[PDB]
Amino acid sequence: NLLPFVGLNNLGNTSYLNSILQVLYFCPGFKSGVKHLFNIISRKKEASYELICSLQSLIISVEQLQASFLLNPEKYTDELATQPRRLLNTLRELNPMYEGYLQHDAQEVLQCILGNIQETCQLLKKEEGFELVEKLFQGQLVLRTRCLECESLTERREDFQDISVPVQEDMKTLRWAISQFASVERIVGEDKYFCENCHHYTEAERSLLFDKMPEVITIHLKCFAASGLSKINTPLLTPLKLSLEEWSTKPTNDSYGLFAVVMHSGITISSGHYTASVKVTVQSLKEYEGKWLLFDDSEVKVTEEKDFLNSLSPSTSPTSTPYLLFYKKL
């Protein structure tokens, strides 16, 4: 009853990395981009590159276990899993916080992996598919400020790789959370704006607008609070399709579809368990299209669309708190 989907063995408190590695394995274009970069690096070596080499090794390991299970599904009884040992080694080389067997942040290790892939790409380009991370996960924000005295407007451009929205004000929807992120906010009182046109402290309106859009939208859910830090376990009402046109600098028809969720389990923020849900997009590998795989380290469950969407609801109070949502451009 094993599915033909390769889980990842927990190597000691490493579910933070495992759920991110599953979401990245199923991200559309990330495997192809890594293979292209690895071809480049391997030609260069036959003529910092270790994150790419060890991600490529992990990707080929997952592919070959899937293939061998589909060939002889009898040699596989307990689980179909592999170990990301070499890539954990490479992450401890790139960042010493991952040394040992402590618990970490999934969004932080995702940010580390993607930042280092981007640095490797910039190195390869500067030395010379070199824009893998920029095309997949990076967008533009326009951060506009309006002085409420003189009503002048200043703008900033900033890059982003995910939208960090709140889950609570201090049932709510993802649209509410994105409005709390990008709708016009009015900064007053202790947080007055310094206007250079007035040469004074003024009240100001700030608003954000999505300018250039990635192919994958990552929503980082701020499911944590300060009073004394606690975890908010009540989710937002999460949609399957998302449009960001309400907060875009131009009209768009580009909508997004939810394809991956990273969940946290635990009543505190200092410990817990990370799991990944992934939507699936040789004939045996099409009875799964449109279905949701739940990755609990080496264990892989399947789930139907409607059951998965129900398990996310705040009304059916879940113990797995959604933390990272992944939407791809339809």
């Binding site: 940010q111 930042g115 900033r156 890059d159 929205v165 709390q180 944590f224 300060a226």
Partner: protein, 77 residues
């Protein structure tokens, strides 16, 4: 000295008066003055990159009206 914005855990924006020579530790101490979060629990994201302790804001090219995003660490494993 310049003014920068910090979008906090509730999405609500605060301001900070900083120097291009202030370090990420000093920025985090000012955020603690305003929010009550210890600097070791703070992660600061600017333009998609996390700001590392030991560096300065000029290292990251943070200028007047730059916005930091404040998140915490949700530990799991």
């Amino acid at each position: 000295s310049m003014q920068i914005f910090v979008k906090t855990l509730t999405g609500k924006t605060i301001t900070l008066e900083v120097e291009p020579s202030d370090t990420i530790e000093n920025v985090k101490a000012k955020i603690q003055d305003k929010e009550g979060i210890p600097p070791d629990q703070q992660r600061l994201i600017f333009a998609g990159k996390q700001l590392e302790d030991g560096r300065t804001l000029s290292d990251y090219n943070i200028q007047k009206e730059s916005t930091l995003h404040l998140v915490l660490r949700l530990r799991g494993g």
